[PDB]
Design an enzyme around this catalytic site. Structure first.
Site, short mmCIF file in Angstrom:
data_model
loop_
_atom_site.label_atom_id
_atom_site.label_comp_id
_atom_site.label_asym_id
_atom_site.label_seq_id
_atom_site.Cartn_x
_atom_site.Cartn_y
_atom_site.Cartn_z
N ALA A 83 0.84 -1.19 0.00
CA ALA A 83 0.00 0.00 0.00
C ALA A 83 0.88 1.24 0.00
O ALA A 83 2.03 1.21 0.48
CB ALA A 83 -0.87 0.03 1.24
N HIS A 503 9.07 -7.35 13.24
CA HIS A 503 10.05 -6.35 13.63
C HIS A 503 11.40 -6.60 12.92
O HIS A 503 12.45 -6.39 13.54
CB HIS A 503 10.26 -6.52 15.15
CG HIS A 503 10.30 -5.25 15.95
ND1 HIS A 503 11.48 -4.59 16.24
CD2 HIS A 503 9.33 -4.58 16.60
CE1 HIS A 503 11.22 -3.54 17.01
NE2 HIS A 503 9.92 -3.50 17.22
#
Ligand SMILES: Cc1cc2nc3c(=O)[nH]c(=O)nc-3n(C[C@H](O)[C@H](O)[C@H](O)COP(=O)(O)OP(=O)(O)OC[C@H]3O[C@@H](n4cnc5c(N)ncnc54)[C@H](O)[C@@H]3O)c2cc1C
Ligand SMILES: OC[C@H]1OC=C[C@@H](O)[C@@H]1O
Ligand SMILES: OC[C@H]1OC=C[C@@H](O)[C@@H]1O
Ligand SMILES: OC[C@H]1OC=C[C@@H](O)[C@@H]1O
Length: 566
Positions: A83, A503
Site C-alpha cells: 500500500a 520487527h
C-alpha cells in the site's frame, strides 16, 4: 521523459519521508515507485480500532519464512503492508522509540553521527503530538513536552474515548509493587517503566495516522513529486563507464499492465522497500554475495556478501485472564529490565548468558557461511549483552489490553534475542518468493528469556492489587501449564503458539564495511556512488520500541544527509 533527479523505491513508512523531504526543493524531481496503491479510503486501514482487520487481505504481502528448525519446524507468516504508506497502514499504531544508549551504540560500532542526541531532533521533526484532554489525563495519558514535536507531519495522540478503568489503575499499582514504576513518557530515551502509550492516530479525525496521510497526501499538489502506484521495482541498472565504483543509472519497473520498462535517476536511487525486499532488490541488481548471485546467473556488480545477512526479528506470544467482573481502561505497556523480570535470580542468568556469547557467535558465523567473522560477532553480541546487563535496557515489551467484558489479554515479546538469520533471492525471477529465515528460538537466551517474561506475567496476574480483579489465568492457564511446570514446558508452549513480531531489521545493516556492514553512515550502499537504503534494513541491532517512530526519524535524518551530498 523517464528521467528524474531521485527515484525512491517503495512508498512506505521510510520511503514517503524521503520523497516528501527531497521534493521540498521545487527544482528537484522525485519519482516514488509503489507496488501497492492508495489506501486513503480503505476502512480496514482508517479504522482507529481496526488493527488485525487487514491481515491476509490484498494489502498484506503475507511473506512466508522457511521451516523454522529451532522453533519446532513450522513456517511463519511475516506480514507487511502492500500500500501507499507501506506497513504503517496495517500495523498496531503504537508510538514508542528506543533506549538512548542503544542508539548511542550505533556510533560506538563505527557509524559516525548516529547517537541519541543526534537523532532526537529528527524524532521531534517527524512528530505532531496532540496533548491529552483532561479525560485522557484522568485515564493515565502523559508526555514530556521536551521530547515531543508539535509541528511534524506524523500526528500522534490518544483515542478520544480513552477512559479511566479498574484494569489500568490496578496494573499501575501491581507493577509498581513489583518494582517497575509509572513513567510519564517512554519516548525520551529512558523506556523502563509502565505507561499509557500514545499511538499514530489523528485524534480529531479519529483515523489511523499512516505514513501516506502524514507525508504524502497533504503534499500531493507538488508538481515535482511523481507517484507510480501498482508499480514494482525489479532491480537497478548501472552506468557503463570506467570506474570500479558502481553508479546507478536507474530502476527497472513492471507496471499494472505487466509491461517492463526503465526509469532513470540523475542523482541517486533510494531503496525503501522494507527489510524483506530492499536486500532482494540489491541482489537482483548484482550487489550481494557472489556465490548466491552466480548460482542465479547474475553477474556481480559489487561483491558485498552480507546483503540479506544479519536478519534480526522478535517473536510474539500472548496470555489472557478472566475477571470476576467487567474489566476496563486504557491499554498499557510495561518495559521491564532484566532484573525486573528475573529479580534476585538475575546474577545466575547473566552468568549463563555471559558464558554462551562466544558459542552464539560461532553458530551465527555459519548462518552467513563465514561472511560474518567470529571476532566481529563476538564484539557485536558483547555490545548487546552490555546494553542488557550494564545499561539495563528493557528486555521485554508487555502489553495489556482490555478484551471487553471480563476478558484481559497480554501480548509480549523479548526485545533483544540473539538469533540472526538471513533473507536471499530464490531465483533471478523478480516475482519469486524469497527464502526468509529469521532463525526464531535459535539460542537458549531467546527462548528462556521469553519463558521468563511469560512466568513474570503469570506472577503479575496473581499479584496484589490486580489479583482482586482477576478470577483466573485462561491462557495458557494452569491445566495446560501447571504451577510446577519446568522451563521446557513453557518453552514448548511458546514455540507452539508464537508468531513473528513483524520487527525485522539488519538485512542491509549500517555498520563499517570491515565488520560486515552493507551501508555507510550516510546510508550509501558500499561499492556504489549513489544508491542508498533507507528503511528498517539499515538498523544494525533491534530497538526496544515499536519501529515506525525510529524509522521516521532515521528517514528524516537521511533526507538531510542526501540534501547535504547534493
Ligand atoms: C502486523 C504489524 C504490526 C505492527 N505494529 C507496529 C506498531 O504498533 N507500531 C510500530 O511503530 N510498528 C509496528 N510494526 C512495525 C512497523 O510498522 C514496520 O517496521 C515499518 O512500518 C516498516 O517500515 P519500512 O519503511 O521499513 O517498510 P514498509 O513500510 O513495509 O515500506 C516498504 C514499501 O515498499 C513497497 N515495496 C516492496 N517491494 C517493492 C518493490 N519491489 N517495488 C516497489 N515497491 C515495493 C511496499 O509495498 C511498501 O509500501 C508492525 C508491523 C506489522 C506487520
Ligand atoms: O541540497 C540540494 C538539494 O538536494 C536534494 C534534494 C533537494 O531537496 C535539495 O534542495
Ligand atoms: O541462556 C542464558 C539464560 O537466559 C535466560 C534464562 C536462563 O534459563 C538461561 O540460562
Ligand atoms: O501493537 C502491538 C503490535 O506491535 C508490534 C508488532 C505486533 O506484533 C504487535 O501485535
Amino acid at each position: 521523459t523517464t528521467t528524474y533527479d531521485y527515484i525512491v523505491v517503495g512508498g512506505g513508512t521510510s520511503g514517503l519521508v524521503v520523497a516528501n523531504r527531497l521534493s521540498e526543493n521545487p527544482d528537484v524531481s522525485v519519482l516514488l515507485l509503489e507496488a501497492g496503491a492508495s489506501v486513503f479510503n480503505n476502512p480496514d486501514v482508517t479504522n482507529a480500532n481496526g488493527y488485525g482487520l487487514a491481515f491476509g487481505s490484498a494489502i498484506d504481502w503475507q511473506y512466508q519464512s522457511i521451516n523454522q528448525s529451532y522453533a519446532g519446524g513450522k513456517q511463519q507468516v511475516l506480514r507487511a503492508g502492500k500500500a501507499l504508506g507501506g506497513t504503517s497502514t496495517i500495523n498496531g499504531m503504537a508510538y514508542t522509540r528506543a533506549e538512548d544508549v542503544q542508539i548511542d551504540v550505533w556510533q560506538k560500532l563505527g557509524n559516525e553521527g548516529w547517537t541519541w542526541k543526534d537523532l532526537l531532533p529528527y524524532y521531534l521533526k517527524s512528530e505532531n503530538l496532540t496533548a491529552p484532554t483532561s479525560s485522557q489525563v484522568a485515564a493515565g495519558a502523559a508526555y514530556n513536552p521536551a521530547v515531543n514535536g508539535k509541528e511534524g507531519p506524523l500526528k500522534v495522540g490518544w483515542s478520544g474515548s480513552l477512559a479511566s478503568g479498574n484494569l489500568s489503575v490496578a496494573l499501575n499499582r501491581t507493577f509498581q509493587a513489583a518494582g517497575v514504576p509509572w513513567v510519564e513518557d517512554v519516548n525520551g530515551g529512558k523506556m523502563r517503566g509502565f505507561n499509557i502509550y500514545p499511538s499514530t492516530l489523528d485524534v480529531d479525525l479519529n483515523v489511523r495516522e499512516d505514513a501516506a496521510r502524514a507525508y504524502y497526501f497533504p503534499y500531493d499538489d507538488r508538481k515535482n513529486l511523481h507517484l507510480l502506484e501498482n508499480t514494482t521495482a525489479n532491480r537497478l541498472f548501472w552506468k557503463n563507464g570506467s570506474a570500479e565504483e558502481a553508479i546507478a543509472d536507474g530502476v527497472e519497473i513492471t507496471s499494472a499492465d505487466g509491461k517492463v520498462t526503465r526509469v532513470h535517476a540523475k542523482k541517486e536511487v533510494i531503496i525503501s522497500a522494507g527489510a524483506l525486499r530492499s536486500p532482494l532488490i540489491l541482489e537482483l541488481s548484482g550487489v550481494g554475495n557472489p556465490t548466491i548471485l552466480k548460482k542465479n546467473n547474475i553477474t556481480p556488480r559489487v561483491d558485498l556478501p552480507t546483503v540479506g545477512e544479519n536478519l534480526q526479528d522478535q517473536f510474539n506470544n500472548g496470555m489472557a485472564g478472566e475477571g470476576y467482573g467487567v474489566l476496563a481502561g486504557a491499554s498499557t505497556v510495561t518495559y521491564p529490565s532484566i532484573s525486573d523480570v528475573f529479580g534476585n535470580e538475575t546474577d545466575s542468568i547473566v552468568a549463563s548468558l555471559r558464558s554462551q556469547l562466544s558459542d552464539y557467535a560461532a553458530a551465527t558465523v555459519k548462518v552467513s557461511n563465514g561472511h560474518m567473522k567470529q571476532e566481529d560477532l563476538e564484539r557485536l553480541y558483547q555490545l548487546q549483552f552490555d546494553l542488557i546487563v550494564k545499561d539495563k535496557v528493557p528486555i521485554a515489551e508487555i502489553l495489556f489490553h482490555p478484551g471487553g467484558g471480563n476478558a484481559v489479554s497480554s501480548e509480549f515479546w523479548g526485545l533483544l534475542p540473539f538469533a540472526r538469520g538471513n533473507i536471499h533471492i530464490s531465483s533471478n525471477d523478480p516475482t519469486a518468493p524469497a527464502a526468509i529465515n529469521p532463525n526464531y528460538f535459535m539460542f537458549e537466551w531467546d527462548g528462556k528469556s521469553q519463558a521468563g517474561i511469560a512466568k513474570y506475567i503469570r506472577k503479575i496476574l496473581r499479584s496484589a492489587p490486580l489479583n482482586k480483579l482477576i478470577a483466573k489465568e485462561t491462557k495458557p492457564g494452569l491445566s495446560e501449564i501447571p504451577a510446577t511446570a519446568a522451563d521446557e514446558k513453557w518453552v514448548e508452549w511458546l514455540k507452539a503458539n508464537y508468531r513473528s513480531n513483524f520487527h525485522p531489521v539488519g538485512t542491509a545493516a549500517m555498520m563499517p564495511r570491515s565488520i560486515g556492514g552493507v551501508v555507510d553512515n550516510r546510508l550509501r550502499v558500499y561499492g556504489t556512488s549513489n544508491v542508498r537504503v533507507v528503511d528498517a534494513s539499515v538498523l544494525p541491532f533491534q530497538v526496544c520500541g515499536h519501529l515506525v517512530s525510529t524509522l521516521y526519524a532515521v528517514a528524516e535524518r537521511a533526507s538531510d544527509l542526501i540534501k547535504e551530498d547534493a
